[PDB]
Amino acid sequence: MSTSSRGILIAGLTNRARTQMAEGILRRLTAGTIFIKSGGVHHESTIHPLAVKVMKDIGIDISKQSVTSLEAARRQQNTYDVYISIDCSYERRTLDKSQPPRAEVRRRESDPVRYDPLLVPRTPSHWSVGVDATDVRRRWQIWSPRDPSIFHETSTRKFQDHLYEGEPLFMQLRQCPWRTQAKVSERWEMDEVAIRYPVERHSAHELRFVQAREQLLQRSFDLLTKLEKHYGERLLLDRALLEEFIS
Amino acid sequence: FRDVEERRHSRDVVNELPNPWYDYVAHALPFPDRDAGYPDEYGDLGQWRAP
Amino acid sequence: ARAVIKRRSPQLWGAPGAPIIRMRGHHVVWKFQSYDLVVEHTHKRRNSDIRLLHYLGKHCPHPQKSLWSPDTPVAQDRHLFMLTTVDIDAFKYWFGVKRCRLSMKPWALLAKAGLLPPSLTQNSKIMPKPLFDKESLMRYYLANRKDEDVMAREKYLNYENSMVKTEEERAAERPVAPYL
Amino acid sequence: DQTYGPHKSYKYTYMPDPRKLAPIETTQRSEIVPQSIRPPTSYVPNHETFLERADIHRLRPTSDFKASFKDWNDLFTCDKRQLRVRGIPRMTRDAIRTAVQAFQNGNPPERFDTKE
Amino acid sequence: RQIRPYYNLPSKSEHGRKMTGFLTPYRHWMWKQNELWRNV
Amino acid sequence: SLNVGVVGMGNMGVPIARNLGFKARSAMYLQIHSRALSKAKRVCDDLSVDGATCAMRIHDRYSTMTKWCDVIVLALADVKASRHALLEDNESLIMNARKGQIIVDHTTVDAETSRECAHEAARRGAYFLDAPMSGSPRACFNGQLLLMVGGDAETFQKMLPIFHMYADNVFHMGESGSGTAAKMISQALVASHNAAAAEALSMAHALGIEDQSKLVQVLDASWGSSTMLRRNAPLLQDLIRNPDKTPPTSAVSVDRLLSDLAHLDASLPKRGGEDEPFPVFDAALRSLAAASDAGMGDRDLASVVHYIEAGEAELRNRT
Amino acid sequence: AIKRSLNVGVVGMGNMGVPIARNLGFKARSAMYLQIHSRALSKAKRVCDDLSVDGATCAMRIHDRYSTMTKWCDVIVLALADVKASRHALLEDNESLIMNARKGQIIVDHTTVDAETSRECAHEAARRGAYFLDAPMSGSPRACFNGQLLLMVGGDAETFQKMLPIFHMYADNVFHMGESGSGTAAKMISQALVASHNAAAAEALSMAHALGIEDQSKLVQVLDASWGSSTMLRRNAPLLQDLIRNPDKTPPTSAVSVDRLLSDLAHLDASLPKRGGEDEPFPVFDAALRSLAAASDAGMGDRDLASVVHYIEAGEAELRNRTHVP
Amino acid sequence: ARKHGLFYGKMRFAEQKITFYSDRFLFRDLVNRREASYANVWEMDDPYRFLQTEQDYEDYWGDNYDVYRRMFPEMIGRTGEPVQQYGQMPIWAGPHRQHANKSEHNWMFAEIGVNVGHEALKKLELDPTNEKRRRFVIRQPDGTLRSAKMSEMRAWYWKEEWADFRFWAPQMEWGIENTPSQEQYQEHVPDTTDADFRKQRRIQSRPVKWFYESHYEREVRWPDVINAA
Amino acid sequence: KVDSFHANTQYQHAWPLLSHDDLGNSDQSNNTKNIMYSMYMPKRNKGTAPWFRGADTYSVKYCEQGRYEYQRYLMINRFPSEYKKHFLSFLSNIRMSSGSATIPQEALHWLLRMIVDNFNPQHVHYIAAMKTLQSAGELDMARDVWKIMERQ
Amino acid sequence: GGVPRIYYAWMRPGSFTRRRFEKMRNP
Amino acid sequence: VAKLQHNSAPTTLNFYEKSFQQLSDVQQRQTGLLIGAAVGDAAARALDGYTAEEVAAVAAESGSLQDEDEDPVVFASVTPREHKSGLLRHHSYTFYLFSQLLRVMATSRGDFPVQYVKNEWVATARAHPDCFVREHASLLHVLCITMQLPVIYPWADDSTLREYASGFLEFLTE
Ligand SMILES: [Mg+2]
């Protein structure tokens, strides 16, 4: 039967490793009955060759998939029902994208410096996520110096003063505060796996894809169980992957 | 909040570097230590008021 | 302390009050608006030719393109730039010796320079404010408190003076055999 | 077949400054610090209740714009430009944004109505 | 500015202000908590 | 405060009263009316056993509901039941309406029905709003419905906190009669996009494209994208590649779409001068009618793909 | 065996070719040598002049003959207007690119063509030893400026992996549909859905005017909340309402036209198989074809697709005449 | 770079200076600088010997030569200055305020004052071997406090738009007439007993960790072990 | 269509290598045929031209000088009542008792600012500074006061 | 007035610009 | 020469990658004695205390190299035994006194007496008494500490260097 779900968006920053594995897992468990669109912000990449091999160990072939942005789906943001943001945690996030991640803030229970859980609260889970880092969109602008309003020497359409006029094709990022308009909105915190650290073996870099695979198997099982109580239908049609996951 | 921060600062290896904006004051005298050329003590063209 | 109070700019404790570090603007449009980090009084002196106490610098709130990207490429060099001049010695003199006041915008600006901690109004909205109980605080204080002389010596180094001579320097500064 | 420009030995015939051709990288504040949305509590269960609790001033008619938002998340995600394009006056949208940012910091709108 | 919440002591007075500055002990306790967080 | 009264208990009538009993924390008084008093007592007992925060009343006639409640909301099964309850009964809600009452009808009725209901309510002094529901019964239980309210503007602004208790998307179409037309246009676009998706996937199988899972990804990012194209294509793939396979039954059926499409041709003006001033609308309607009488009426809306050529049978022979 | 840059050429400065060349001139920072071809050298000089004064990061080179464009480029990308110009530039000319292709070249066609043209182009490119990809583009020139174009690459997968860094400079959604001719069929299906959804949105807004709905934007929000949403409806509904409420108002000219969509649907009809010597019936698609033909026969084919509305019943006139002849 | 509708000229000299024929000492300085200079410098000479990698070779001569030559007027053994980073002062609020230093843009801060901001001492105020160097800081958008680059430090002064393509300082004569004597530097008579500022700066430089273990002549020894003894 | 009109009516192709001037000049070894044009320009400009003092260097003496070597000895005379007032002010500022608002180092500071402001510190100032620094236990600061007295 | 300030350098007899002007006004 | 920008390629591989181009030829050898000792001590940290047969057993148990992975001996992924105190899990105890001597040398702005670093070194040995009694007054540990002394002035002769180092060599053997 045609399902009542209008679509599933898997938002990311690069659409390279984690969102490609999440599209492959969610398509198998729903048996292709639900439209699933996985996209990112920076589309200038290919699917990682370890992301295809690790998914091939289960039997999922994501080699037919492709890296694509969500720019076609930002105009149709109100038409999709489910919105998933797969991004790294803000305590472990690094902006250079060339180092291993930092250590999170540790709290006391019942040598890293542990904090008090009453003095340092832990961002309680009943709150919602308004905008994520995956909720941006690209904005291309060009200020050409052949426009006589920009070529004039007293003009604010330049990012300098005395060097030149205009600016050739600069890119800025907007915000998309429409993830709360979706019916089901979740955020999945997973570490980065698409960038290899300073010196690290191929067996150790592949192991991070295996650990990111088991987290995506658990989170997709919790997502589809929530959506089965939301719509009221059966969305875990193929349970051949879950019997290896439960056992 | 002071002791936990000072222990975390002493265990951290990155923020143990010296900071010239925080560690010291470079100069506290009212006059600079070397001559920058100024003043001129003379007039120029179009200046009638001298001194 | 007037009969008819100036309704638009009220202050505290009369004029001229404590010296305060402010970020004053110009009467121009936003696209050419810049700010001056200045030290002035609590009430602005409009009857003087000396309208400020000290000028700490100029902040440009518009981001500039990084014109120095091919010099030495470091991490996050091609991002935009916010240019500001900060008089370090005059700020430390008016902050420590004269004990001036601070608005929240110069505090947030100087926290970016490494001179001050982040301000009280710079809120991390994902982390709530702490909750204090005296029993847990007493247990943590009795778990690890510093020694009395060590605390006194670190206070003496931080507040009183930090250049205290060693014994190897006292043995060097003392006179020698023709006078000793 | 010809190269563009009469010089034909230069990479750029107009010879601009090489800092013009330098790229500009970008990073949103959403990558630095996220924005969370608190759920409605028992004190403010709806968004019209949140607007009526914030109406304390005569010149800030906050309770006049209950129809300007669809639900709680639309009230708590709109910035001041989106309040401006919805047709809200300046003091009213400033009071709305201040009440939203105070509720985000942990301060519910508990203030005395100073109208009478 | 000193905040006047709705659950303060109301002054039933037609010749002045309608709400006093007399708090609740919960307001005293949470003000002490905010005082310590500023004291750090 | 305002007293609210919900009339009619069916498959869709119960969760509106359940959400009005849940979210109204004893501020707005709740009254329940039904076609039978036993069903009203049953739904009142069901609201009583699971936790009721507000007092609720049970009535067997519309007169006490009129004299007690300010706001009356109706959720019935068919058009003729709402026409009997609102206008044709002796103790009618609109013919005996109080001045200042607000009567909202959530049934998909014709345009003339909403027009005469608004006319009788405007002569009585009340305000009539037509707001037909779009959504699932479980989505109504979770609080997600689409409402297109037509009526007065300030009356619509008075009904926004009541409409937000059981619906997320509540829009104002304008004057009365514009809310009941929006559901007709919406289901007409649903039928047209379903027929277009069936024809497009039939031509995709005719051209010999073997990978449809990548075809929907590019077709969603093109200008010929639609939500029905995302919905029906995994079922349409199996219905095309296995034409002997019977389509499965769904919640939404061909007859459920044709029941709302049967209101549109009565609410439209006379087409007999040009005989077809709506090409793809009748091109989808004939395919749905050919799918209905062949035994596939109760099944899913993806059954149009076997009756695409049957939509040409009423065009070659009738001309 | 010289370590050098990639010679990348763009043939045809038209509606969509010049933003492709501008994106390749901006976003390729000293990694390629750009060639720009046109029939008139003044247009290529104008495009290279605007790229030089706006500030480009690569060196550019104008061409006026296909022979130097063949012998210079490692990668050739064609963005032309119609199938006839693409068939002339690829196969019919004496100096054409595929007929004189060197060993190892890669030729990508962004012009939407028929299936047999792409089949013969890929066959002659494989015969010469080169590679051919057919990747019909979907999007507006404003969407081409923002780098958001839709590409359906048919051809070799390793050539697709080689050409993805060039395809990601002006297109975000780039899919590999499979063998040669798959992307052309995908473009045909996409434009068939475009015409069908345009006719559906036209009839929807005519129903909205006939039933007395004043504003269209709230109807667009209602349809976005429900299952009746489509891209062409949200694209056309303000102009559809302004054309229906003002029934004498002439539509404006857009980048897409009735003639271009009719040419692409004619390619689709030439590429669609028949059963039993007769055409397979599709009622909604034939109804949209009748409306587009009635819009094009009145001289209103150069304007936007919304121009079908003032001739939609006229399309039925085109069928009704075809009923009364014996 | 030339604009369209106007004519341009050519500078005869870069600076308004006094001639070297006006004095014998300026003449001898010019002759001694020309002997220590090249006549034509190419890609293989000693001022271009810092280009040890072909990537640096293609970076310097390609697409940024007009920026790389405009860094410093005189040709030196490099093109700029090495970048070093500073330590962050401890924020006693802890992780409540650890997010606030990370921002969108780079925040550049420069020093001003009485001692700082004079262009005539500009190469003295950007000298890394000067204890009173003009302090610059740049907070990155990820919160890192680093120093400024050489062009970043020179951007805060007046423009210096000339370049020296001849003089190479390792070719200076040092054996016959250029002989700096230690007795000439001893004529200033720098003494530590007559002025205590140098020893005070040395005391301000050294760590003060001994003040906490003062009571723990007494001299500091290694910790004596009792488990191994 | 809005880009087809805006042509390059602003820029021009750059100067080639070994090019001449628009006035006909050229950078040769012989500049007798070349001329200067500084005398044809207007004499004063409101503002600063982009070529105004673009390459202007200063003397080496500014960058080879030591610290505080430019200060000449100025005999700043004043009234004797001003002498009494400033001596009493500095003597009261030295003798401030070290509480929570005053560290004892200020007793060394107000002596030093007495010499920076070109006053001769009397013997009572040295006596008060040494007694104030001995009362706070700062003996090396008192010996530094003695060294300040000897270096004067 | 009508003449620019560079007029005496442009039209000086023997210059490049004056010889170009005399050559183009009389070929 | 320049390739198409793909897979989000980084501009620089390290913070100080292009800062080493901004040093002289002697300053690259001055920092080579400092940074090269820091790289070498961190590479052999995980195999500290291993015998020659146990090091060869590490390279034998991992025989899968894709030619992008380096030698498994350098920066090994083996589990350490004492596994450590706080800071010493990345560098040895000899490097802790090496890093404290470098920190004094940077702030002293040149040559400096041994008394500036005496209180820094005895605080480490008081914190790690097990690593102190293993390595004190040995030829390997003393030589690794005083290795960084000719960075202060590399053109000095052996007579000046051994005179300056003798104040450091006596306290490390006392
Ligand atoms: Mg994708």
Side-chain angles (χ1 to χ4, degrees), chain C residues 55-59 63 66-89 92 109-125 127-130 147 149-150 153-154 156-157 159 162-169 173, chain H residues 64 67-68 71 79-83 88-92 95-115 134-135 137-142 144-146 149-152 155-156 196 199-200 202-204 206 208 210-212 214-219:
Chain C
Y55 174 80
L56 298 188
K58 175 193 174 184
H59 175 55
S66 183
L67 316 176
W68 320 274
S69 310
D71 188 285
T72 296
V74 236
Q76 299 96 13
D77 59 326
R78 286 162 165 87
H79 296 246
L80 297 177
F81 266 75
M82 312 279 292
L83 300 189
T84 311
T85 60
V86 170
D87 201 339
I88 309 174
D89 315 332
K92 289 183 182 177
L109 186 54
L110 291 166
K112 300 279 177 54
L115 274 160
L116 289 170
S119 61
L120 189 65
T121 53
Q122 280 173 319
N123 292 282
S124 60
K125 297 184 178 180
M127 279 182 49
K129 297 186 184 180
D147 203 358
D149 61 327
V150 182
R153 283 165 189 273
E154 69 96 6
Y156 180 82
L157 283 180
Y159 294 162
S162 293
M163 37 180 182
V164 263
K165 294 151 60 180
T166 77
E167 189 54 60
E168 320 297 308
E169 302 164 347
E173 265 86 270
Chain H
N64 292 128
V67 181
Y68 272 129
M71 304 298 192
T79 174
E81 282 286 331
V83 185
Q88 173 70 32
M89 49 159 293
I91 312 166
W92 290 5
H96 294 268
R97 307 304 194 209
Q98 280 190 1
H99 82 304
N101 294 128
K102 305 181 183 61
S103 59
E104 293 215 4
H105 324 272
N106 294 88
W107 295 79
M108 182 162 205
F109 300 95
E111 195 183 0
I112 46 178
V114 268
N115 189 25
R134 172 168 189 173
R135 289 175 284 182
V137 87
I138 293 164
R139 183 170 296 277
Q140 295 183 345
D142 74 282
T144 305
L145 282 180
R146 69 169 175 92
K149 299 177 265 185
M150 187 55 179
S151 55
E152 279 171 332
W156 292 97
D196 282 4
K199 295 180 296 183
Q200 273 163 338
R202 287 278 279 178
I203 287 169
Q204 287 184 350
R206 51 99 167 146
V208 286
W210 65 273
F211 205 65
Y212 315 107
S214 55
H215 300 271
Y216 294 90
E217 189 61 40
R218 321 161 306 170
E219 52 100 2

Side-chain angles (χ1 to χ4, degrees), chain A residues 10 15 19-20 23 27 36-40 47 65-70, chain F residues 217, chain G residues 173 175:
Chain A
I10 304 179
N15 199 24
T19 83
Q20 296 289 333
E23 190 185 3
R27 195 162 296 178
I36 295 160
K37 170 68 174 181
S38 79
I47 310 183
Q65 303 173 350
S66 61
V67 181
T68 167
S69 286
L70 276 181
Chain F
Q217 292 289 327
Chain G
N173 317 280
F175 299 95

